[PDB]
Design a protein around this ligand. Structure first.
Ligand SMILES: CCCCCCCC/C=C\CCCCCCCC(=O)OC[C@H](O)CO
Ligand SMILES: O=C(O)CN(CCN(CC(=O)O)CC(=O)O)CC(=O)O
Ligand SMILES: [Ca+2]
Ligand code: NI
Length: 377
């Protein structure tokens, strides 16, 4: 139960790589709203380009080079985007060229994250169960750590420099490239009743009510005026509540069926998201705190259901019809976020983000109805 010399450099590489990746991706929606205040639409259009382009394009050594050039291009193009919009001449041909170039750096930034995760065959197949159990502590450390830290870097900026934190996050990402490289260099359908079980899981990917959702982050900062410090605290806590689901779900799976554990978890998610939406339409004084607090509670239900849906798939489809339904599972999940970010791209202003919250609760409640009806076989 001891990390090896090479196995430690693998762990130390995943930590440095993901910390820089996540911290930069957290502050990018904040930067896109600093530049374009009152237009969540533009931040949604940015990610729509990244989502599509990433899917299209998708070699292990190129990972750190791609992130380096991506963050480098992002800082140069974010600075140009900032200075040009601040001049006063809007909707130039030049304004579009910089944005699309900035969005092409987002595709490049995402490919580096995926490829560098591939590099994290080298661990002894006996010591792999201790290894794989450790990476979860590293991954958990970046989820809680980088949004919290990066939110403090973006929010505690000097007076006349709102994007002062963005470049500090990118300069971090560039300077860390020298550690990361040497570490990684050294050690490197039509008629199937189970289609409805997939579709119930898929609908939940249309909900914007996520602590790790970029659309919530833009709305929380722009319209609801939450500090990036408290938005990061929102994100880091959202990962901690999903951890609670790792105890709650095996415990209900013992005293109740695996179906009842998934049903009561997905039912819990819908209930707590319903409470959140009501307060979201209430006096915004202390109801924002309830709004975000109920989203945290709902993570236990969502992650509980995802473990059930995964386990139900593992026990229900035979190996012959397995990879095909995975193409279906991956399809519906892709289409949901595609629809999510396409619908958000059409928002006439940030304020009508409320109309995406409502469909989200509709989807979570609907996904509940579909699973309850399915689980009656
Ligand atoms: C390997 C070691 C790597 C060390 C990093 C060295 C980075 C140099 C270039 C950085 C690019 C410059 C970033 C642009 C700054 C900028 O444009 O700031 C705009 C200002 O905020 C007005 O809006
Ligand atoms: O929240 C987002 O930005 C988009 N999420 C939403 C899908 N979520 C479901 C949720 O958080 O409600 C997937 C998941 O992590 O379970 C996609 C992703 O995490 O890859
Ligand atoms: Ca990096
Ligand atoms: Ni999500």
């Amino acid at each position: 139960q001891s990390l090896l010399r090479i196995e430690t450099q693998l762990l130390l590489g995943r930590l440095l790589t993901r910390s820089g990746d996540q911290a930069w991706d957290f502050v990018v929606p904040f930067a896109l709203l600093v530049i374009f205040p009152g237009k969540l639409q533009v931040a949604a259009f940015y990610y729509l380009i990244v989502k599509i382009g990433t899917f299209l394009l998708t070699v292990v050594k190129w990972g750190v080079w791609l992130q380096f050039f991506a963050i480098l291009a992002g800082m140069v193009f974010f600075g140009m985007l900032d200075g040009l919009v601040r001049a006063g001449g809007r909707e130039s041909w030049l304004l579009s060229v910089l944005f699309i170039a900035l969005a092409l750096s987002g595709v490049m930034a995402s490919l580096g994250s995926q490829i560098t995760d591939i590099s994290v065959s080298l661990v002894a197949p006996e010591k792999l169960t201790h290894f794989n159990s450790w990476l979860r502590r590293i991954d958990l450390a970046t989820e809680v750590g980088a949004p919290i830290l990066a939110g403090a870097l973006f929010a505690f900026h000097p007076e006349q420099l709102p994007l002062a934190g963005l470049f500090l996050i990118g300069l971090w990402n560039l300077v860390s490239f020298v550690p990361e490289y040497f570490l990684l260099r050294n050690v490197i359908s039509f008629s199937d009743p189970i289609f409805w079980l997939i579709l119930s899981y898929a609908l939940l990917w249309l909900s914007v009510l996520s602590p790790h959702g970029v659309l919530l982050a833009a709305y929380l900062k722009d319209e609801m005026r939450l500090p990036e410090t408290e938005i990061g605290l929102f994100r880091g806590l959202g990962a901690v509540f999903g951890l609670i689901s790792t105890v709650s779900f095996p415990y209900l799976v013992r005293r109740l069926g695996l179906i009842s554990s998934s049903r009561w978890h997905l039912g819990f998610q819908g209930v707590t998201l319903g409470i959140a939406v009501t307060a979201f339409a209430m006096g915004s004084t202390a109801s924002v705190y309830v709004f975000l607090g109920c989203i945290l509670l709902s993570r236990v239900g969502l992650y509980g259901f995802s473990n059930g849906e995964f386990e139900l798939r593992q026990r229900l489809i035979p190996e012959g019809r397995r990879g095909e339904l995975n193409s279906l599972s991956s399809l519906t999940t892709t289409s949901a976020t595609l629809i999510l970010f396409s619908a958000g791209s059409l928002l006439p202003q940030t304020e009508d983000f409320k109309y995406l919250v409502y469909v989200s609760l509709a989807a979570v409640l609907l996904a509940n109805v579909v699973f309850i009806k399915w689980s009656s076989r």
